Design goal:
With about 325 residues, the chain is mainly α. It has one domain: Catalytic domain of cyclic nucleotide phosphodiesterase 4b2b. It contains 14 helices and no strands. The radius of gyration is 19 Å and the shape is globular. The chain binds ligand J8J, magnesium ion and zinc ion. Magnesium ion binds next to loops. Zinc ion binds next to α4. Homodimer. It is found in: Cytoplasm, Cytosol. This is cAMP and cAMP-inhibited cGMP 3',5'-cyclic phosphodiesterase 10A. It comes from Homo sapiens (Human).
Length: about 325
Amino acid sequence: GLMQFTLPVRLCKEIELFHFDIGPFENMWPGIFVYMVHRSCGTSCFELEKLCRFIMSVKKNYRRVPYHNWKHAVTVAHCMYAILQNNHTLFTDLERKGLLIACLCHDLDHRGFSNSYLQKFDHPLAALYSTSTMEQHHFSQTVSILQLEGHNIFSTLSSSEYEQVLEIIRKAIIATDLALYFGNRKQLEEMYQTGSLNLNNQSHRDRVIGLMMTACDLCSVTKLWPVTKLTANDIYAEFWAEGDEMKKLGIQPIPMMDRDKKDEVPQGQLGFYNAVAIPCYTTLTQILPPTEPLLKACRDNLSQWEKVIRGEE
Ligand SMILES: O=C(NC1COC1)c1cc2[nH]c(-c3ccccc3)nc2cc1NC(=O)c1cc(C2CC2)c[nH]c1=O
Ligand SMILES: [Mg+2]
Ligand SMILES: [Zn+2]
């Protein structure tokens, strides 16, 4: 009730910044998440008994994959935390609640393979969900855990508020399907520059929350260079593994996933930053100005990758 979580000073201070790294100590991540909830939302938003129980069941349902794991779950949620804290008059009570949970759950039960690979493998999830295959699985897993005896952190909400916060969460999680992001940022670009962007339009809020989600999901390109560079090892470990499985199906993988083209990774990072990361945080800064640090950090890392190519490291 009047029981709040504290962090060491350095963590207390650095956690408010966008570029915070949650550290190598797995056991502090749940305290870190609860801390962000109490500060983003209130000591009252969730019952501490239930939240802790939900947090730990979620953690257990992330797999020990190189990148799409429990560390990613909490990292993406922290980015959301910082976007919300730098924009706190813009979001409803319900949006603060459901967005931080959405981020923690957004990759539940990920196996480290793309929607594309499930589809070429003919995995049963590809028959159950034709588009955004993994992302619909994630939201389904989320509802699963929410219905475990003792786990419904939303029990105090009215019938109507409950239906809203699940609908926030669901759209939020589908949004992390990067295949949808390009269309969403383009509509957001037009609306912003023709002045028709209206945050009181619910369908506009949806688009904005979507972009927030892409921004949080890719936040590893907005960390300090040594974090970004080591996170890249984890992503390619998954990519190259999936490429190995593509070869096992008798398919040449895209170079992104072919581990015989390690040498061309810096150039591949360059195009990604140009085609995705920079446009994403640009458009996000245009809508939510206090999120400028993400664009500045992304740009800085773009600059580091050009240096890697030029043989300056
Ligand atoms: O454009 C890309 N992919 C999108 C387009 O539609 C999906 C892309 C293309 C890439 N070509 C290469 C590459 C080329 C030649 C030789 C070797 C490698 N490497 C890539 C990485 C990429 N992407 C990410 O590194 C990436 C990173 C992350 C998290 C860190 C934030 C999440 N998702 C990602 O896809
Ligand atoms: Mg995902
Ligand atoms: Zn993710």
